[PDB]
Enzyme design. Structure first.
Site, PDB file in Angstrom:
ATOM      1  CG  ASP A   1     -12.185  -1.966   4.522  1.00 32.39           C
ATOM      2  OD1 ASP A   1     -11.336  -0.979   4.590  1.00 32.39           O
ATOM      3  OD2 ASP A   1     -12.373  -2.483   5.291  1.00 32.39           O
TER       4      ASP A   1
ATOM      5  CD  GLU B   1      -9.742  -0.974   0.305  1.00 27.23           C
ATOM      6  OE1 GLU B   1      -8.543  -1.107  -0.193  1.00 27.23           O
ATOM      7  OE2 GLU B   1     -10.014  -1.315   1.420  1.00 27.23           O
TER       8      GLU B   1
ATOM      9  CG  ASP C   1      -7.692   2.955   0.682  1.00 28.09           C
ATOM     10  OD1 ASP C   1      -9.107   3.107   0.747  1.00 28.09           O
ATOM     11  OD2 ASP C   1      -7.136   2.479   1.672  1.00 28.09           O
TER      12      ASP C   1
ATOM     13  CE  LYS D   1      -8.847  -3.645   6.465  1.00 27.75           C
ATOM     14  NZ  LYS D   1      -9.213  -2.308   6.795  1.00 27.75           N
TER      15      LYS D   1
ATOM     16  N   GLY E   1      -5.495  -5.360   6.198  1.00 30.85           N
ATOM     17  CA  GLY E   1      -4.702  -5.235   7.046  1.00 30.85           C
ATOM     18  C   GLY E   1      -4.932  -3.915   8.004  1.00 30.85           C
TER      19      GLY E   1
ATOM     20  CE  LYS F   1      -4.739  -0.787  -0.133  1.00 31.98           C
ATOM     21  NZ  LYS F   1      -4.173  -2.064  -0.089  1.00 31.98           N
TER      22      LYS F   1
ATOM     23  CB  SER G   1      -0.970   0.079   1.327  1.00 31.02           C
ATOM     24  OG  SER G   1      -1.696  -0.969   1.597  1.00 31.02           O
TER      25      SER G   1
ATOM     26  CE  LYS H   1      -5.377   8.227   2.256  1.00 28.41           C
ATOM     27  NZ  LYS H   1      -4.520   9.193   2.788  1.00 28.41           N
TER      28      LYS H   1
HETATM   29 MG   LIG Z   1      -7.096  -0.747   1.907  1.00 26.24          MG
END
Ligand SMILES: [Mg+2]
Ligand SMILES: CC(=O)N[C@@H](CCC(N)=O)C(=O)O
Ligand SMILES: [Mg+2]
Lengths: 360, 370
Positions: free
Chosen positions: A230, A205, A180, A254, A282, A153, A127, A155
């Site tokens: 999520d 996401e 994300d 998760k 995570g 990933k 990430s 942000k």
């Molecule tokens: Mg994420």
């Protein structure tokens, strides 16, 4: 056979980052073994609604008295003995997951194996936070690609999304790229998020509100890039509702957010029955949580890489004796019964803010 | 002009409960009353938490909420100056959920602000009813010609709606009993959150007993299954636990998850958000009614004021205080007659803590300053 939960410890650690993180642990003792799990609720409710103070009060005042002294046939029976109470899934997961570890250890069998997984290694992604500009994004992506990560990933946020994604995909036409969106968008941003479509992201996401499915379903009608949920999937029934509504085509799973391993396996199987993949999310876990995550991830519908990267990237020094280190985007399952990892009690003592012990 | 919150008190009290209140999620005999008092400009605002010690009706807990108040919300507001309650509510920040906790702050802010102006709370929210219709929610009963004991008593008092708590498998019985011993009253049930779509057949049975609605028959956090169940039965569904914000209410109504909302002020984050829920419901042509949470007179007074808004078109659960407590935490009586509860006079909530009595049943107290 059956197992009796004789004792329980709550230990709150303050674990130095590579400035600190509060790690709540539950240890359940029975039949000559112990199970350990890690709370992923924070001091204040930022990722989701639960807090450490609410959660620990719930444990010590309610969940622990309900199971101490009682004899159980499996972890499902342990969860059932708590079940009146609403929400508080992360609090619940502490008990449920320690139970799975304890149970597995009375049998001498690895946790993932009992959940039905048979991978010896699990693919991992990385990430990236927001960088200052395009080339700086591409440089960091290029580093992580060279380290062998199997998914990148980025942000993103309003004003900074198409640019990093465009620059990245230009430089890397074939990598698995995701973003994300961190609930920072509204339905008005549909046209802007649709500009990502030409860059073949595997998913975006949770771009809209953290507890929404309905507006996600609408956004997914307006763009072609798949959505990943999520915070809005906290149960198997949520998973079902999300997939059937077309709220997304991928689930960030998760284990603690959904209430533990049994319910996580249910989310995993529900998603699979829609032929939608899940991947392991995570939450900055110490080695206890990371290890539970790795075992859960050996299940077959974890078909996209997970956030169970090297522990060394987070902690100067971990709470367990065993190093959890990924190589070439593959994290090995830690060997042994249950989670296959072991608290380092002396190290843990040097960073223990508080601890307590309960019996029947 | 603007107001400055100079101080805040958290006072936790315990009051014994006159009736044993069963419900599908447990049995309640006492009530913990977490109070928040905000101080500023020579007046005070008071609100009461509706969270329980253990998460039974919903997800929040007293320990979680007070910790959130003392560690986060109170520090964010103390010594600060605000134009209105909306500004206070905006200063708490971006934290997720914990609506009842937020509501303690927000509703106390409304009382305080109303008191700086010298105006009744209801009035500032847009209501202009001077009394509100009320019914009663009865707990779990015994049989066909002896469940009507508790109901007889309440119909003789003129309560405008009767509500039976139910669960599996205690539903079509208690209702059958009630409906021919009393064939004409407005009657409803609080399926209280206990069923699944599996039980649809069992619930369509209630259609022949002419209910205004069935309250929250399925999961507490669900809208989609409710929408489906509503297609299969003729009785309106009422949502309670599932609607914790105005956007929730919009999603519920657009989906057809219900045609009625039980609006609990604290459950949705306080008065401003309740006004919003109220207006969203009205825009869909769905009425609201005021729910109850076994409140002391502080919370009951806040409820009566909110209830003066025009889309409160069905009788609420705001019954007489003397049904619950031998002695309330306020000086004023909040008693309905003939199913009508009058609006307590005065600025803000128009009720007043009886400080001497409150001190005999306080089990915790703390003061916070800048
Ligand atoms: Mg994420
Ligand atoms: C928690 C919940 O079951 N309480 C009652 C409220 C009526 C009375 N308790 O004020 C209800 O019917 O909503
Ligand atoms: Mg109710």
């Amino acid at each position: 056979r059956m197992f009796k939960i004789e004792a329980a410890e709550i230990v709150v650690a303050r674990l130095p980052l590579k400035t600190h993180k509060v790690v709540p642990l539950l240890i359940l003792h029975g039949e000559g073994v112990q199970g350990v799990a890690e709370g992923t609720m924070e001091a204040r409710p930022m990722y989701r609604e639960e807090t450490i103070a609410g959660a620990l009060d719930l444990l010590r005042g309610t969940f622990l008295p309900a199971i101490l002294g009682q004899t159980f046939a499996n972890p499902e029976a342990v969860s059932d003995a708590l079940g009146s109470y609403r929400g508080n899934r992360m609090a619940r997961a502490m008990v449920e997951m320690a139970a799975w570890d304890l149970w597995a250890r009375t049998l001498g069998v690895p946790l993932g194996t009992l959940l039905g997984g048979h991978k010896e290694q699990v693919e991992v992604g990385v990430s990236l936070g927001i960088q200052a500009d395009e080339q700086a994004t591409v440089d960091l992506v290029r580093r992580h690609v060279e380290q062998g990560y199997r998914r990148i990933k980025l942000k993103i946020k309003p004003g900074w999304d198409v640019q990093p994604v465009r620059a990245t995909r230009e430089a890397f036409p074939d990598i698995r790229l995701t973003v994300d969106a961190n609930s920072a968008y509204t339905l008005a941003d549909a046209g802007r998020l649709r500009q990502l479509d030409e860059y073949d992201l595997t998913y975006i996401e949770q771009p809209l509100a953290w507890d929404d499915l309905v507006d996600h379903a609408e956004l997914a009608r307006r763009i072609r890039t798949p959505l990943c949920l999520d915070e809005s999937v906290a149960s198997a029934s949520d998973a079902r509702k999300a997939l059937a509504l077309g709220a997304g085509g991928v689930i960030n799973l998760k284990v603690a957010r959904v209430g533990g391993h049994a319910e996580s396996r249910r989310v995993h199987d529900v998603a699979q029955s829609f032929g939608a993949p899940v991947w392991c999310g995570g939450m900055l876990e110490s080695g206890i949580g990371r290890a539970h995550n790795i075992h859960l991830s050996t299940l077959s519908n974890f078909r996209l890489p997970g956030d169970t990267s090297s522990a060394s990237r987070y902690w100067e020094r971990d709470l367990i004796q065993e190093p959890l280190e990924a190589v070439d985007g593959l994290m090995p399952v830690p060997q042994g019964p249950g989670t296959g990892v072991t608290l380092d009690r002396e190290f843990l003592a040097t960073v223990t803010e508080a601890q307590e012990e309960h019996r029947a």
